[PDB]
Amino acid sequence: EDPQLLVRVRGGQLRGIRLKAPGGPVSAFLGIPFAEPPVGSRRFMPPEPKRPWSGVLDATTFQNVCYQYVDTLYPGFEGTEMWNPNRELSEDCLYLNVWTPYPRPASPTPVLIWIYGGGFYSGAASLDVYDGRFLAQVEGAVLVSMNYRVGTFGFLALPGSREAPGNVGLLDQRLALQWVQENIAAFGGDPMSVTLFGESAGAASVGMHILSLPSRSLFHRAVLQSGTPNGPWATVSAGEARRRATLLARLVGCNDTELIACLRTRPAQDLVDHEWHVLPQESIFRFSFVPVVDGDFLSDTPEALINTGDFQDLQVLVGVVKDEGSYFLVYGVPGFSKDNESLISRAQFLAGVRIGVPQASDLAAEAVVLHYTDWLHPEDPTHLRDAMSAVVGDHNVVCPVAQLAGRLAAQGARVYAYIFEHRASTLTWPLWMGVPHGYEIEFIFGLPLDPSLNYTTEERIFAQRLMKYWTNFARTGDPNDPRDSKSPQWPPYTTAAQQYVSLNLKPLEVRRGLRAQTCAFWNRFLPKLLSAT
Amino acid sequence: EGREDPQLLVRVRGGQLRGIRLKAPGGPVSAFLGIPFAEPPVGSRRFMPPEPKRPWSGVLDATTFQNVCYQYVDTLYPGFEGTEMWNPNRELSEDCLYLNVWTPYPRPASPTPVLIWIYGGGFYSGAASLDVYDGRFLAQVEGAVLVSMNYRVGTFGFLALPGSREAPGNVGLLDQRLALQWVQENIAAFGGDPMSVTLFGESAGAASVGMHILSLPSRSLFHRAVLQSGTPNGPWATVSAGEARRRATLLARLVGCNDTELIACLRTRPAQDLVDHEWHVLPQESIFRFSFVPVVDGDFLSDTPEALINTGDFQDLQVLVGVVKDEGSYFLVYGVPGFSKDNESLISRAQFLAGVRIGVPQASDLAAEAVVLHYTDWLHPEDPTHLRDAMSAVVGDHNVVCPVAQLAGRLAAQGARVYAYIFEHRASTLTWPLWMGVPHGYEIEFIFGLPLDPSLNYTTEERIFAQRLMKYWTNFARTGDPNDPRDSKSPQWPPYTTAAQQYVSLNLKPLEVRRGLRAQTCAFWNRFLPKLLSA
Ligand SMILES: CCN1CCN(C2CCN(C(=O)COc3ccc(-c4ccccc4)cc3)CC2)CC1
Ligand SMILES: CCN1CCN(C2CCN(C(=O)COc3ccc(-c4ccccc4)cc3)CC2)CC1
């Protein structure tokens, strides 16, 4: 009976488990409930705080994954399976996990809260790549991660209605944040030093907590990895949210009250089965149910809020991987596949752009094609394929990120920017995809320190650097070592110098302008093109 | 006769000529200057097509340059070499349709290739008698026969009331053609080969050449062509009949004037009256825009140049084309606020936006912003030096480089053999400020070989450079290949193809082959922006 593995939170007692990490043991408390199960009548509803419990609750295993669509494009393929649920699915899923060093921290410790991604339709805190044992052991951090409702269960909304107000998936996150404030001190964590970090839909979520005032009192620093609250995919309007909900209802056999009633009486899979068939266009990087501009959680559009927000005492770390768009091409764009080199014609390229940019008018689409064409080699299938990836990557991530970083820096925020350019030696996706969306994560969480995963010895050294950057940023709001000299230093991103760094096997290198001319095209011109048409 | 130089006496279809023996650095040449090739386009013949010169009696003196065609004269920088060198160096008059001939002294044994120069000047100015068009160097050093003609400019050359009898338009181009016909009939008398005639010209002259390529009756008067910093396609080289009709009618009103009655009244006006008003009819505040230019009349030009270059067959055509490095800089000091030759012309972003509207006068607010955003340096969007050099590039790319790029592209794709160059050497003798780099028209003095004249204070390297280019141009006229067959040691100048898009740098250093002429940027101007003005 290890007293290190025993903790009293406000809801009662927990029994953690001692886990072996390469450099030593860590105390893990997995599967802690922070909310009443959002089941039956609580479907589509805001989460309620967990009722106290008797005795000692067993917090030694990962709990269920929020009911969600499971990918099927490449059954058995490791590259896809690493993102699929690794526990049983259930609407009863609102549990969070906690890692601390072993022994428990003597002094109050910085808290890292991970918010996973998955297009707001998938994901789980129990995936191996989110294993928080390495950060807790090496950097002496307290890591926290929560499940939150995805898909219809988390973001289906009939705006203005009482029984489906929307954004409950975000409120799931917010409640887990409140839990950390109220309870993390018992784990040796410092609630006055909470750093949110997430990836993809997770990064966008972190961003929405930045833009929602009630959330702001629950953290001190933020990290957005390859995702933003602004951009074409992270949010929908109230009108469009109301449209998709009513269509899904129709697709399953269903006054707002009475319509949501019928949906509550439907097996979880019946909703998921029709989840993807409510999208207005054929598209990639588009997600049926996502956060909504409701005037509540989001008082206005993210664009509006980032444009007029005071970010005076905020510190943020943002970045992208080298190939943000490649992953999405094999999931809808004809000509692409993980199994060949996906060399495409110029014709396929024009077609894919209508899919990568479902919003674009004919003129706007052609403007994209003409901008991304290599007029020295306009027919070269390699360039066209690599260009199709860039259109998607830049439209959906890089330039949304560049825009956000610009607005934040300009309006008083402290900003550090990176680009991640190392491809894992263990990667199973083809070489033409390069460094796909999501594959910085395993390095930040320090999995290469696990010798069994067959990572190269250089990657282990690389992973330790990144863990240092992230945790130094968590401790201080500055990823730079307060002990290291020549390197050189990671400088703040500013609207003037626009400096960012490259994260790879080679030392930090400072560059300037994050695809500036291309993002000028996406962020300044094309909007004018659909604001006149 | 009796005591004249027997090499300086020559007969042509219209009578006898007395040429003059001229000194060049390397020896003598024969010059026959001021040869009339048309009846004076005066009185009732104003705005009318040229009638061939009626034969004369006796020996016409052909030893000095004749009158310069009536035209506006630059007054922006009085007493400044940079402007004076382009200004008329003879008397202005409507009686101006004469041409000039240089030949080796003595005239050559076998018939020699003929070069015909067509001067530029925005179709509103120019003269074949300018020092920079001196054909004595090409004749002496390369053994070439060099011809240059005066052609009517401004209203006298291009004012059109399309469909009318008394003002059909393009008469300025018909002057050029008549001179080409004159060469076909008479140049043999000078030892020139009428079967090997190469046209070459700059700016509005290069455009003119392109028009002769695209006009059938002219195609039988030459065999090869060179276009320097100009094209018949593009925004300034032509106008619609409707537009020409409007500009003509407006000018009439501005001086106090049924097409017949209107033209008749214009013919009663002093020549200076017309010049004093021709600039006041431009639809906008603009640079690199000229009031009276070739019109698409459906006659000389059966259709728009863009149309004809896109559909025409050019298999049997060989053409040499190119640009200078800073095509647009010259034009900024002539109407973009913030620019001058006497300061560094560092401008603000606001002035850049304003300049774009003047340099792209036919653009919407959207089109204009697209230009600005395309040409902005987003790492330094406020940097005045980058904004200044961007304004030059916008004007340069829109008016010359991308029209030339389009032209080379279409011609190569449709059978033509195309050679492409960029000229990057700034004359050490240049009096324009350094920020202008290599401006519009300052390759010419090197092509004509002026550096070979020791009294002009060029560097020795420039003298070798000039000789090298004279070889390129004359080799091309001689063979349809600027390369020297004898010399394979030197780097070759490859034809421009759609595939490789090869072209050469022309400077003090040896030939360097590059690929794509503003490929990305010209995709913007030639593919995107047109389809933006389709909305
Ligand atoms: C956290 C990092 N993650 C996020 C994204 N990554 C992949 C997974 C799936 N993606 C899609 O766009 C799904 O598209 C579709 C489209 C259609 C259907 C479908 C639905 C019903 C019937 C048939 C097909 C399913 C998925 C993006 C790329 C994996 C790693
Ligand atoms: C053969 C190579 N050439 C071609 C062009 N080069 C210069 C000369 C003048 N340019 C103009 O656009 C004139 O503009 C204007 C605008 C307005 C007025 C004006 C008219 C009436 C009253 C006041 C001003 C005059 C000229 C272009 C750049 C010189 C060498």
From Swiss-Prot, chain A:
Tissues of expression: Predominates in most expressing tissues except erythrocytes where a glycophospholipid-attached form of ACHE predominates.
Reactions it catalyzes: acetylcholine + H2O = choline + acetate + H(+)
Subcellular location: Synapse; Secreted; Cell membrane
GO biological process, one term: cell adhesion
A single cellular component GO annotation: basement membrane
Membrane topology recorded in Swiss-Prot or TrEMBL: Peripheral membrane protein
Keywords, alphabetical: Cell membrane, Disulfide bond, Glycoprotein, GPI-anchor, Hydrolase, Lipoprotein, Membrane, Neurotransmitter degradation, Secreted, Serine esterase, Signal, Synapse
Glycan-carrying positions: 255, 340, 454
GO function terms (MF aspect): acetylcholine binding; acetylcholinesterase activity; collagen binding; identical protein binding; laminin binding; protein homodimerization activity; serine hydrolase activity
Record-linked SUPFAM superfamilies: alpha/beta-Hydrolases
Entry EC no(s): 3.1.1.7
Active site (UniProt): 200 (acyl-ester intermediate), 324 (charge relay system), 437 (charge relay system)
InterPro entries in the record: AB_hydrolase_fold (IPR029058), AChE-related_enzymes (IPR050654), AChE_tetra (IPR014788), CarbesteraseB (IPR002018), Carboxylesterase_B_AS (IPR019826), Carboxylesterase_B_CS (IPR019819), Cholinesterase (IPR000997)
Further information: Synapses usually contain asymmetric molecules of cholinesterase, with a collagen-like part disulfide-bonded to the catalytic part. A different, globular type of cholinesterase occurs on the outer surfaces of cell membranes, including those of erythrocytes. This is the catalytic subunit of an asymmetric or soluble form of ACHE.
Function as written in the Swiss-Prot or TrEMBL entry: Terminates signal transduction at the neuromuscular junction by rapid hydrolysis of the acetylcholine released into the synaptic cleft.
Record-stated family: Belongs to the type-B carboxylesterase/lipase family.
Subunit and interaction comment: Isoform H generates GPI-anchored dimers; disulfide linked. Isoform T generates multiple structures, ranging from monomers and dimers to collagen-tailed and hydrophobic-tailed forms, in which catalytic tetramers are associated with anchoring proteins that attach them to the basal lamina or to cell membranes. In the collagen-tailed forms, isoform T subunits are associated with a specific collagen, COLQ, which triggers the formation of isoform T tetramers, from monomers and dimers. Interacts with PRIMA1.
Protein name: Acetylcholinesterase
Native source species: Mus musculus (Mouse)
The encoding gene: Ache
